[PDB]
Amino acid sequence: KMGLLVMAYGTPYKEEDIERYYTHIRRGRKPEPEMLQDLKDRYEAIGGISPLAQITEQQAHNLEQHLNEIQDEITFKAYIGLKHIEPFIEDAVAEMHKDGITEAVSIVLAPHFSTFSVQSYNKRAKEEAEKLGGLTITSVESWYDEPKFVTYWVDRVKETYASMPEDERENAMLIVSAASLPEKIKEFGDPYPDQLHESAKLIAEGAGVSEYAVGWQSEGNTPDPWLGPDVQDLTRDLFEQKGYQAFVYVPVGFVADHLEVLYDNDYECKVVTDDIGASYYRPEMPNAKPEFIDALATVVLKKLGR
Ligand SMILES: CCc1c2[nH]c(c1C)/C=c1\[nH]/c(c(CCC(=O)O)c1C)=C\c1[nH]c(c(C)c1CCC(=O)O)/C=c1/c(CC)c(C)/c(n1C)=C/2
Ligand SMILES: [Mg+2]
């Protein structure tokens, strides 16, 4: 019986939880009334918060079921650990420990390694396990290069391009993005930026797309600079330089239909394309599709040498 610790940033399960989620992200400070209202507005804008938290649940559940289905050596038990939403990462480890689990494999629902989004989760998780004792966690650190994951996006892209009208297919620009982070991660030699660039190349060459670019999105609002250029500005600058008739957005850094994709892409990036008279394209996110789950299953099994 092995533990399967699945971690992610987290999304509120109920609208009544939006505020605390914000506080947690703001590290103890409740958001300003307007600031809070502006987040609530965005969730409504995309159809409600309700569906979002369910996707992460289905991903972990399906991953557990598939891993236990494709091989008979190990029986996995999934535990969700989130950064800003209960069950928190430390709560999930505590529960694995309480349940008697002595060995566990963890994986973050973000393909690129970064200090802020993968290393900090693994660290928090392992430190809690050590404090409890008798629980050893083996952590997946990056999987953006897993061929089945790359293939997933390559196929979604080939399809989008093959469904475009003639004019666009010859004047389209592919934008591969991930969640931006403070530039100070460089102080730690964080390869996050490099992994994104490689992720973009792998997908572009796989789909046979030659015109593509790398951008960042969803940066937080702090006094420090964040990884740029932002997808919105990148789209404008690229249009100004070649007048592309279409932009295809691949938020490879994200795995589900969350706020960053449904809003920051489907709304804010479409605002830019609409403004410049270009079509907007954004292939389906992995969510809990079997093709994606099989990719994660292979990633976990490989980490275990199986
Ligand atoms: C899911 C994509 C993502 C998000 N944040 C990070 C990532 C990887 C990382 C991060 N977001 C960050 C940080 C910490 C930056 C730091 O250490 O200063 C990381 C690693 C926080 C941040 N994020 C935001 C703010 C305003 C801040 C600063 C909070 C403060 O006032 O202290 C904004 C959000 C929000 C809405 C609350 C979301 C959903 C969110 N951030 C941008 C997205
Ligand atoms: Mg924003």
CA–CA separation, 15 and 299 (whole Å):
33
Ligand 1, residue 29: give the atom nearest the CA: 31
From its phi and psi, is residue 91 left (phi > 0), alpha (psi between -120 and 50) or beta?
Answer: alpha
Please measure the distance between the N-terminal and C-terminal CA atoms of the chain and give it in whole angstroms.
15
Give, in degrees to the nearest 5, the angle at Cα 121 between 117 and 127.
150
CA–CA separation, 260 and 254 (whole Å):
8
Contacts of 198 (CB under 8 A, 6+ apart): 144, 145
Residue nearest (by alpha carbon) to ligand 1 atom 5: 220
How many Å is the Cα radius of gyration of the chain? 20
CA of 98 to the centre of ligand 1 (A): 31
Residue nearest (by alpha carbon) to ligand 1 atom 30: 26
Q: Give the long-range contacts of residues 265-269, CB within 8 A, separation 24 or more.
A: 265/177, 265/217, 265/231, 266/46, 267/45, 267/46, 268/231, 268/232, 269/231, 269/232, 269/235
CA of 264 to the centre of ligand 2 (A): 6
Residue nearest (by alpha carbon) to ligand 1 atom 20: 116
CA of 271 to the centre of ligand 1 (A): 23
CA–CA separation, 51 and 258 (whole Å):
9
Between the alpha carbon of residue 196 and those of residues 24, 90, 162, 177, 250, the distances in Å are: 27, 28, 24, 7, 11
* Residue list, ligand 1 pocket, CB within 6 Å: 9, 22, 25-27, 39, 116-117, 179, 181-182, 218, 220-222, 259-260
Method: X-ray
Between the alpha carbon of residue 190 and those of residues 110, 219, 253, 254, the distances in Å are: 15, 17, 15, 18
Residue nearest (by alpha carbon) to ligand 1 atom 38: 220
Ligand 1, residue 117: give the atom nearest the CA: 8
Segment (H or E) for 280:
strand 279-281
Segment (H or E) for 5:
strand 2-8
Residue nearest (by alpha carbon) to ligand 1 atom 3: 179
Q: Which ligand sits nearest to residue 268's alpha carbon? A: 2
Q: Which ligand sits nearest to residue 271's alpha carbon? A: 2
Residue nearest (by alpha carbon) to ligand 1 atom 9: 181
Q: Which ligand sits nearest to residue 259's alpha carbon? A: 1
Kindly list the structural domains of the chain, giving each domain's residue range(s) and its CATH number in brackets, ordered by start: 1-143+286-306 (3.40.50.1400), 144-285 (3.40.50.1400)
Q: What is the DSSP string of 173-200?
A: EEEEEEE--BGGGGGGT--HHHHHHHHH
CA–CA separation, 180 and 189 (whole Å):
16
The burial of 126, by beta-carbon neighbours within 10 Å (0-12 exposed, 13-18 middle, 19 or more buried), is given as: middle
Residue nearest (by alpha carbon) to ligand 1 atom 34: 220
User: In a 3-state reduction of DSSP, which class is residue 77?
Assistant: strand
Name the residue of 11, 21, 25 whose CB sits within 8 Å of the most ligand 1 atoms, as the mutation to test its pocket.
25
Buried b (16+ CB within 10 A) or exposed e, 34-68: eeeeebeebbeebeebeebbebbeebbebbbebbb
User: In a 3-state reduction of DSSP, which class is residue 26?
Assistant: coil
The first and second tokens of residue 204, run together, are 């572009």
Q: Which ligand sits nearest to residue 219's alpha carbon? A: 1
Q: Resolution limit in angstroms?
A: 2.4
CA–CA separation, 20 and 22 (whole Å):
5
Q: CA-based diameter of the chain, in Å?
A: 62
